[PDB]
Each structure stands twice: as structure tokens, then as C-alpha cells.
Symmetry: C3
């Protein structure tokens, strides 16, 4: 059964503007350790960040809570499987919420165009 659904659209130029304002501080804030390692050596760091931000926002919506009760963007880790498909890995409070809700499967998709990154997340029992 579907336990939740979330979507996000991110203006890549906005992420770019935040980076101009505060350097790597947005990345330090929203990225897990594994994602941070990827960001550091990524070919297009702004685009990577915009995409990960989109998944994290969609995930928070999919859990039906948004960011609250000790949740945080850095607890929603994006990784890719061997074929390139995006996946979610949960940490701390996010992981505890998933276990409480009885989450068995987390479906993630990412898309981008020149100006926008979009993501949709479905969580399932």
C-alpha cells in the first residue's frame, strides 16, 4: 500500500544564487556525509546539489511531515544503484520515522532540464 507521495521542483538558478551568497554552506547543510563526498569532486556541483535538494524536499513531503520533530534534509541520503537509478537511504530521525510507519519500499525518480530539477518520491508498505 502507498504510505505517502511527494514532489518537488527546484529552480537551478536559485541554488546558484545561494552558492554565490554563502559558498558551500547550503551543501554542508543539506548533504549527508556520502553526498558531501560526491559534491566535492562532482563535474557539475550546482546541478548535483539542485537535484539532491529536490529529492530531499519530495521525500519530506512523502513522509507526510515535511521537516519537523528532529527531521532534517541531511537524513534523506540519495544514492544511485549500479544502473544509475536514484534511491533513498535514511539516517537518524528519518530512519526511525520510516520504521514506525512500516515503510518497506521507497521509490525515487529525478529529472532535470536546463533550468529546473524535479523529483517525485513514493513510500510503500
Amino acid at each position: 500500500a502507498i504510505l505517502g507521495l511527494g514532489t518537488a521542483i527546484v529552480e537551478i538558478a536559485r541554488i546558484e544564487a545561494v552558492i554565490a551568497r554563502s559558498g558551500d554552506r547550503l551543501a554542508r547543510r543539506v548533504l549527508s556525509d556520502n553526498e558531501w563526498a560526491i559534491w566535492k569532486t562532482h563535474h557539475q556541483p550546482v546541478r548535483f546539489l539542485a537535484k539532491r535538494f529536490a529529492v530531499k524536499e519530495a521525500a519530506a513531503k512523502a513522509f507526510g511531515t515535511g521537516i519537523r520533530n528532529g527531521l532534517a534534509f541531511n537524513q534523506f541520503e540519495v544514492f544511485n544503484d549500479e544502473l544509475g537509478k536514484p534511491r533513498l537511504r535514511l539516517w537518524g530521525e528519518a530512519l526511525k520515522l520510516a520504521e514506525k510507519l512500516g515503510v518497506a519500499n521507497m521509490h525515487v525518480t529525478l529529472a532535470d532540464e536546463r533550468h529546473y530539477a524535479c523529483a517525485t518520491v513514493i513510500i510503500e508498505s
Copy 2:
């Protein structure tokens, strides 16, 4: 089982142009009574309308009038669907037990996805 899936993208500027041309007529046509009440006191009514239009369009596609697809938000802010009239009747016929709604926006666009489920 998934009974239906719908998505929508709405250019907020397009909605603004409709409102410039015909006032609050669009809002009168597509909003339910509860949504209308929110529209009247909203700090950003056009954006509220664009987002609700997005959900309604997505809901219509998921089922395969817009004011019969009411958007409300729960205690945590999560968007939800409430059905009226012919929409409610259709849902019972199809055996819809669960309806999942999400919406998002940025400066120029609002987006929504709706999944209906047995």
C-alpha cells in the same frame, strides 16, 4: 492496486493573465466553498489558485467539474483530496479507498501529482 495517476504543471503567469482578463471568475468556477473561503483571505490568492488548479487538473487525469475536487490540508500541512457530487459518485463506483496528493511550486510554476488507489 493503483486505480489512476495524474500530473499537472501550471504556469502561474498564465493564471495571472486569466485573472487580469476576467477577475475572480476562474476562482468562482474551479474552487469549492472551503477553497473559496481561503482564496478570499489569502495573502497570495493567485498562487493559491494556481496550486489548487494544478491538483484539480491532476485529479481529473487520475480519474480519467474542478470544484468537485476539493483540496484541504491536514494538521501537518499535507495536501489531501475531498470529493463532491459526480466525483464522489465516480470514486465509489471505481472502488477508490485512498487518494494521494502532492504539490510543489517555484517562482514561475506550480506542479501536482495525484494517485488514486483501491
Copy 3:
């Protein structure tokens, strides 16, 4: 059970620009024979192609593979049923892979505005 999820966003102007520089080449590669016939006489052919790209990219992502192992965008044929709702018809490797994955239901939606087309695909047991 959800077997996969895919989404895509297409800037219509980008498709317009590719057509301006290389004509029919983009369309011939990604469209099935049925879609090609429609493209050749469609009243809004660029918009048609952009929407087809959106669905096809979302479908390739929903299968969890992207374009690899003999899969091709021209194998994910979009058609509209007697009611008018968008549907997927699969060919070649895509058809074979769906069977092997145990796909019993495919859910397709698409949307467009003046500048952008988008689509989401869910495959299900």
C-alpha cells in the same frame, strides 16, 4: 506492488532548437512507426514530440534501466485509448523486459504548459 517510478521534464524550446538544426533526425530515432505517422501530420508537431520525449524518458526510468541492453525509446509507444487517456504500448526488448519483471499494469500521465512538458510513469505488478 510498485515495480518502478519515472518522471521527466522537457523544455519545448530545446526540442524546437534540435529540429531547427537537424530536422527529422531526432523524431525518427525515438518514435515508433505509429508515432512517426502522427508526427508527420500533427497540427503541433514540436509539442507532440516534446510530450513523447517526456513519456519515453519517464518510462525508461520507471523500468529502472534507462536506455541500455537493447532497450530504445522507440519501444515505448504512447497511444490514447477510446476514452482519451494516455497509455503505453511496448515493443521489442521493452515488451520482453516488462514480462520478465512481472509488470501487469502501467500507469502513464502527461501534462504540458506553453514552455514545458512533463510526464510520470508507474509500473506495477
